[PDB]
Amino acid sequence: GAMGIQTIKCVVVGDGAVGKTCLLISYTTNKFPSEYVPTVFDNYAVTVMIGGEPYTLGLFDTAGLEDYDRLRPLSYPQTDVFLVCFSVVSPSSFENVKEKWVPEITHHCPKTPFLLVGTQIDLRDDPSTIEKLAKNKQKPITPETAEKLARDLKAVKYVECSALTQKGLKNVFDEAILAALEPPEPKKSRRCVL
Amino acid sequence: IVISMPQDFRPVSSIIDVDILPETHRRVRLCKYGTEKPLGFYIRDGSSVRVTPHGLEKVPGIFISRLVPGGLAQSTGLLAVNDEVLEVNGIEVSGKSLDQVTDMMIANSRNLIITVRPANQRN
Ligand SMILES: Nc1nc2c(ncn2[C@@H]2O[C@H](COP(=O)(O)OP(=O)(O)NP(=O)(O)O)[C@@H](O)[C@H]2O)c(=O)[nH]1
Ligand SMILES: [Mg+2]
Numbered sequence A: 001g002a003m004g005i006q007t008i009k010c011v012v013v014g015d016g017a018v019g020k021t022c023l024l025i026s027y028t029t030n031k032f033p034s035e036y037v038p039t040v041f042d043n044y045a046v047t048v049m050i051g052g053e054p055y056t057l058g059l060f061d062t063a064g065l066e067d068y069d070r071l072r073p074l075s076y077p078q079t080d081v082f083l084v085c086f087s088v089v090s091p092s093s094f095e096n097v098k099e100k101w102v103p104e105i106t107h108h109c110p111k112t113p114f115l116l117v118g119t120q121i122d123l124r125d126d127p128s129t130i131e132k133l134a135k136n137k138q139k140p141i142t143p144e145t146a147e148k149l150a151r152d153l154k155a156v157k158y159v160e161c162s163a164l165t166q167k168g169l170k171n172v173f174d175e176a177i178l179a180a181l182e183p184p185e186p187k188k189s190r191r192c193v194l
Numbered sequence B: 001i002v003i004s005m006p007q008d009f010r011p012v013s014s015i016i017d018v019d020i021l022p023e024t025h026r027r028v029r030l031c032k033y034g035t036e037k038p039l040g041f042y043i044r045d046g047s048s049v050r051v052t053p054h055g056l057e058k059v060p061g062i063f064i065s066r067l068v069p070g071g072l073a074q075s076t077g078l079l080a081v082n083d084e085v086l087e088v089n090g091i092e093v094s095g096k097s098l099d100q101v102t103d104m105m106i107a108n109s110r111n112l113i114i115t116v117r118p119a120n121q122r123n
Helices: A021-028 A065-073 A091-108 A127-134 A145-154 A169-181 B072-076 B097-108
Strands: A007-013 A041-050 A051-063 A082-089 A113-121 A158-160 B008-016 B026-030 B041-052 B055-067 B084-088 B111-115
Touching: A007 A021, A007 A091, A007 A169, A007 B026, A021 A051, A021 A082, A021 A113, A021 A169, A041 A065, A041 A169, A051 A065, A051 A169, A082 A091, A082 A169, A091 A145, A113 A145, A113 A169, A113 B084, A145 A158, A158 A169, B008 B072, B026 B072, B041 B084, B041 B097, B055 B084, B084 B097
Parallel strands: A007 A051, A007 A082, A082 A113, A113 A158
Antiparallel strands: A041 A051, A041 B008, B008 B026, B026 B111, B041 B055, B084 B111
């Protein structure tokens, strides 16, 4: 609705094509975008009832493509929580979580909490997918190693989903919302100051 | 703690036409929640020094002078003070007066396409 008793700003980052936009569109409209269109910058808002009261969830989609690195920091000011994404069937995306994505958001917003989000989990058992990976001696990433990275990189926690089937979809955002609210300290102290 | 599914989905802003525009420009899209609230930024008169067909001249320019706190423009992070306004929904602001550019924005406020030349912050 028109009002919200608190605004939670959630920014989503991760390699190109890992499923950031579909994740967001699937969650908010229950629609799965048809074809892939790279994101430059998109901002949306939804209202979510928390404790029976309206809360504004500001969703900020960013560019996974490095061509747009220059523009990415624009999404960072005032972020309350970050979703760092990688496709569970994309080893390179997972590697970039530790080499680009976490360093980047942590550099700009040192005190903002972030969740590690595994996407496209419906592809773990996809023939084509499994064949190509193996065609280069690669396997999907398992929740085990993913959770280990969360741990090592200081993520609030690790969560995975599929925007296609929506499996674990709502829980990723519920957890995001929680990470923005739970810490025993003022939220203003966790909000990115840029 | 109970958290519902999302409701009242709304696209608010975006950066478009990034590939076909000079790197020094930014075309922003703003879609305000409702007819009654402000876009959240004021614009002022100013001069811009440019290389014209006749040389480097100082010509009339339009600039963002401030952002309402907690406002729409501010919440997006796509507009800042000192950014020069160049175009509004296909209409360039060069032959336009400050009041006209202000009117143009109000006219297109429900679906605004504003192209600016961002100001650079000292590192
Ligand atoms: N099987 C399956 N495919 C998915 C899923 N989510 C995304 N994809 C695939 O990935 C493509 C790119 O999705 P997209 O959401 O636009 O991701 P991106 O991370 O936003 N890309 P960019 O960083 O360039 O904007 C989609 O066309 C789709 O085929 C999923 O949950 N399951
Ligand atoms: Mg995208």
